[PDB]
Amino acid sequence: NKPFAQQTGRFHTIELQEEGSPDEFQELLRLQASTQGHVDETTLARLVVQKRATKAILKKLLETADRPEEQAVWRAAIERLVIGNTAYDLKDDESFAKLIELAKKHPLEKVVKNVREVQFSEKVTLSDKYAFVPASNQGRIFLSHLRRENIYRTPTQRPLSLKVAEEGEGVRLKEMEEKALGDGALGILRPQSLGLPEDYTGVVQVRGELADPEGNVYAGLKGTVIVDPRAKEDFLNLNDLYRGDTVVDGKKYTKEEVDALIREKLKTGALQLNLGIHRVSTVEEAEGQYSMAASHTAYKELDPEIYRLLEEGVELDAEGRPIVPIVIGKEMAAKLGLKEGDIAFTFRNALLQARVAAIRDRLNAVVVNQEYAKSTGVDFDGDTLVVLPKGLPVDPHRLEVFQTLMAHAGLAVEPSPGELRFKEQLEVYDKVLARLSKSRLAAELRNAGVEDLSNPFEVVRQLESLGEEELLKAFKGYLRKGFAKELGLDLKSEEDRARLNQYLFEGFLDYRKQFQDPRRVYKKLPLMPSAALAASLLQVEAHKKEYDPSDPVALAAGQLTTSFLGLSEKLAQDLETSIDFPKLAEAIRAYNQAYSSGNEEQVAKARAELVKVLNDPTVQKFSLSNLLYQIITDRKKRDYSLRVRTESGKTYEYRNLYAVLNRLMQNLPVEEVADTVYDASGQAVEERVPLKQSATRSLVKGLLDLASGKVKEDPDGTVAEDLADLPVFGELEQLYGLVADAKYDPSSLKSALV
């Protein structure tokens, strides 16, 4: 309902972009289009984030001369401010006095127009949208800026307060494997303890913190919990909380160092958990219905049938479309007309075929194994799965297809077959089957309608399907004597005999209820040779780097550069209308076949065919489009870059993804907008970034005082044409101070700005 900053009180929040006012960053971004990609987006982003934030912090520092002890917290979001020639070290009671002095005597947009430098506190955490600063200086908040924005900017409803302790009544803090309850998941507590309607049974998405009476907060939490009355204690996994890795009072405290501090407070019974609910998992319609996704691993304890069910593999159907075990609720199973064993479909708000393996009375999640839906990138912090009925009015894609496209685009690589869930059992069965097929008993079976004896799950099914109890005792009795010999068990020894029925039935035959063909049910799904190929064709990857953690602009600057994820997505859709998915699919199926068991000529020819479909320009651009969308989405957290390795042998690094997106769009070569160029092994052959930066600060200065007449030149063929008639122009002028120092050769300005 409102930001967890405000529902908890930790931080004060000031907005960075005012009411409906124009996006000055979207405008600067067409300096990137005019220069054909030779300015630096994240520098443009910096100038904007420094302006927007300096203005906000002043305007607050003025509306807050009346609430004057609340002002003092905003004072220390800015250390030193250079306006004109005078410099204002706000820590001085002197300088600060003077700063608020001129603050009133001149209107805001003129004070900001003149700030030449600004340095922010370690205390202010800047983002694309807000400036957060902590409420009281008394305590200390042991998490990094990235995580404060992560945890505290989300809207949650009114925050609860739960006791943490190890013995007694409260919440307990186990120390298990990381992600042990699934990735986005960080705890299992009872519906009652966080105040939900009696015996709720689902998952709920929270934004909690872990604090003490004195105002120190040691870990913050972001993700979901699993609500369930069937579990005994309310417990949070500690290794899934965000703690440490930050600098309190000049020292970095590591994860490990803060984890020590918690165990010491926890023992003293002075450690709470302030938790805010953000969305409670209903089951609501979409046809189709959907709710949140839980990992089956968070059920080995409570309801281990669910755990063990989704643990025993996924089966590829006869056409290669994986069928994945899910577990749905009563409500859902109703409205969508499904019962145990029904094949449905599911996708995250790739479209996979689902096999219902269970139905529960009070469940309102959709519980899946995550390793088998990694192809729909399900994330157990809030992601929702949709289920559609058995009606199947669509074409669900093959494992090779998308697994091959996903790989061509750097988001998966070497051809491995799977791990068969039933490997050793099926070898035994094939040894026995040799003899069975020769026997009289096999003639009897084929006379009663069972022709193909190769699928034991089918022979047993098709039997009990049609009468034939005697032929079933005979088939079941045959395979006993068979496996017992095959495994050297003595069939008389009553504990050796219970070991057969343990191996043949309990471990093998009974799974005929979940799977259709044992020969196609996998423990580790395979990697099709076409996708290992597809990945060797494009050398595109998403290289990780953290935003400078010392400097609070880097992140907010970074988040502004995300603000065209729109165009990255239209590029994908507009692109995919072209690709003939028919021929893509056949060319892949050709290769994977001719790979597995094919002659030498075809493993040659199917290779050259698929390759020519994969090197097709519209395919390459489609896959490259898909990568960029992931990178841009991830730059909302880290300084990710694109890297590409070309026929030159060299690899190019990009963090100007808006120029990359334009070049892809207008079918221009993408290499000149690269930031750094590396030499095969050799690195740093060309570092283009420092040039691109001071160029940016020049062109901005140009664009600005060309549009305002301070340059006697023709603001006409240029991007300054009509700028000064536009609302956004009043905004851009508030960042003239930060680009004043720059210089530009006035002749070549008209050329740059066209």
Numbering used by the authors: 327 to 612, 680 to 742, 750 to 812, 821 to 1162
What's the publication's text?
Thus, the N-terminal part of the giant gp96 TMP protein appears to be a virion RNAP (vRNAP) that could be responsible for the transcription of the phage early genes. Several N-terminal fragments of gp96 containing the RNAP signature motif were cloned, purified, and tested for the ability to extend the RNA component of an RNA-DNA scaffold that mimics the conformation of nucleic acids within the transcription elongation complex of other RNAPs. While the shortest gp96 1050-residue fragment was inactive, 1200-, 1360- and 1540-residue fragments extended the primer. We crystallized the 1–1200 and 327–1124 fragments and determined their structures at 3.1 Å and 4.4 Å resolution, respectively. The structure of the 1–1200 fragment was largely the same as the structure of the 327–1124 fragment because most of the flanking regions not essential for the activity were disordered, except for two helices at the C-terminus (1125–1162). The overall architectures of gp96 vRNAP and gp64 nvRNAP are markedly different. In contrast, gp96 vRNAP contains no defined domain at the corresponding position, resulting in a clamp-less, flat structure that heretofore has not been observed for any RNAP. We hypothesize that this unique structure enables the passage of gp96 vRNAP through the narrow channel in the phage tail. Gp96 is exceptional as it lacks the C-terminal region, and its connector element, which is disordered in the gp96 crystals (gp96 613–679), is twice shorter than in QDE-1 and phi14:2. The disordered region is likely positioned close to the RNA-DNA hybrid duplex during transcription elongation and might dynamically interact with the nascent RNA strand, moving similarly to the clamp domains of other RNAPs.
